[PDB]
Every structure is written in C-alpha cells, then in structure tokens.
Amino acid sequence: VNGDNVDANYSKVMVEPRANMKFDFPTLKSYDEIKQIAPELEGMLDLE
C-alpha cells in the first residue's frame, strides 16, 4: 500500500563512530580543589 519510498524513512540513520585520538596531557585540577587535596603545603618545597 505505502510503497517502498515512504517506509524507508521510518528507519533512522545511525552515527558511524570513529576514533578521537587526543594526546590528553594529565587533567589539571583547579587550584581551589588541589589546595583541598593537599593541606597548606604552599611555597615550602624548592621547585628547583
């Protein structure tokens, strides 16, 4: 009845997934939350 042209639109076309290769440097947390991970250890080690 409805033909082969209308019933084809009933099905959806999916997304063909592909890779998303990033380099992803370690995720830097915010300073406010990283001052919570460690207590007041600020300015106390020699960075050199």
Partner: protein, 85 residues
C-alpha cells in the same frame, strides 16, 4: 478455509504516474464445497487512498497464479512456417 479462487474486480483512480488516488474493490469469494456439489457464495469489500498498490489483488496473486489452464510447452517447433504463410 484452505484455499481461494476469487473472481474479483477493482477500480483504480490515479493521482500521479503510479500512485493511486483511491482503490475500490468488491469482488466475490470462492472455495470448494462438500461432495463436489457447489452452490452460491459471497463477496468482499475494500477502500483505500494514496496507495501504491491494491492489497486484495496483490495478495491473491502473491499466494499464487489464477486458474491457469495454460502451462507453456517445453520447447518450440514450427507449425506452418515458411513462405506459404
């Protein structure tokens, strides 16, 4: 019911090249009766709109061909071929 031999009749209305604006089918119903002693039968009914085919006729055909008293012979031979035809 195990089989049909409908003698049907339909009515098409085109709105474009192939699609039908409407379908009308009334036909008749057929099947075998008791001891090869057949009597009267009944009919059918159908309407449609903006259709690409007739369900009734396509169904009857799809299950099989009609009462076909014509099976084609295997190979061809001439009948009166030549210049005397």
């Amino acid at each position: 019911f195990d089989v049909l031999t409908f003698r049907c009749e339909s009515t098409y209305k085109f709105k474009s090249a192939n699609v039908y604006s409407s379908i009308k089918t009334t036909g008749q119903v057929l099947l075998e009766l008791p001891t090869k002693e057949v009597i009267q039968v009944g009919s059918v009914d159908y309407e449609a709109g903006t259709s690409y085919g007739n369900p009734v006729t396509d169904y009857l055909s799809r299950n099989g061909k009609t009462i076909e008293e014509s099976v084609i012979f295997e190979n061809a031979i001439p009948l009166s071929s030549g210049e005397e035809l």
